[PDB]
Amino acid sequence: TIQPGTGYNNGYFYSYWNDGHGGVTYTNGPGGQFSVNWSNSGEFVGGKGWQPGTKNKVINFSGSYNPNGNSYLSVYGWSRNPLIEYYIVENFGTYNPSTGATKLGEVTSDGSVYDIYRTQRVNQPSIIGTATFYQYWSVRRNHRSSGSVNTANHFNAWAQQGLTLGTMDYQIVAVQGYFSSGSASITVS
Template sequence: MLGSTLVLALSAVAGVFASPLELIQRNEEHAEKRGIQPGQGNHNGWFYSYWTDGRGYIDYNNNAGGSYSVSWQNVGNFVGGKGWNPGSATRNVTYSGQWNAINQNSYVALYGWTRNPLIEYYVVESWGTYNPSSGSQRLGTVYSDGSTYDIYRTQRVNQPSIDGTSTFYQFWSVRQQKRVGGTINVKAHFDAWESSGLRLGTNHNYQILATEGYGSSGYASITVY
């Protein structure tokens, strides 16, 4: 839409309207600048996952090794990053990077899924204007890697999941002292969740160091090691 409008406006100024073929070619060039298409796969020895609801502008790119970058403008919802498939309950995840969305609805988190039961989980390292666990009851805390994390559980009803539209629980550890970079002791969070009555599934799906945005704009460049 934006590409077509811009082409027509420039053509009108020049006194010549672009042909339909030119519009298609220019739109394809614009689309290429948006990075890879949403999906999952392997890149440079790392698993990646990138999902969007299709609203707004998102430019997600897989870079060398465990690195990725993403810029977004006026999005609905997206989440993307690199990591592993399957995930692990005992992994130490070390990462570094930049995240320019402090005044936006966005967060950087270790993000993953399990089955049996279906659970979506987050270890939130940094968040902007909205705490993603707002409105839910705090079930406990865990101290790990230099900060206290608050533990929450929320439920999603008839929402997108790795098994299509489903109803499932979300488990959260939300870091009080925000950071972008460091090591996440995954086992510490999983053990704390179980102690709080939150049991993950027995079948681990993917586990990535993700950037997520909702109704926001921003930029992130993250490397997982």
């Protein structure tokens, strides 16, 4: 494993964060590759991409994703002003992160319909400190662990629905886990 933090590896921004519980390891490989292995973890997020992201990036990902419990595989990032945490979810484990969330529409992109949702985090950690902020979700109906995400299709559909993004902060393909197990090996470009 590498130490939790952010930086650059083989030309790609990476972020790896965990809550200190144990049970997760993250490694950076050649090019845009990263791996994650976890067993009875706590909370974590790790992956590779860009800092800052853009609003018209076509992100390509490929590999394997084998969750055993609660985990997501997504294009994941933040905006500032307004502060937003966003996800384009290509696959997940035992929990669909949109469960119980208000549906804000649909968008068709890259071979599947996605359902769009907004949720809110109240006094939770963020890139600027503890804050209350919205989360935007596009959840792919047809699950996969390789493909291409035309981010503009999502960001445009979100804007159409009133879900405004500010200036982009980081933008990665990420494996997120919440007290689960699994393995993943993903290459980004």
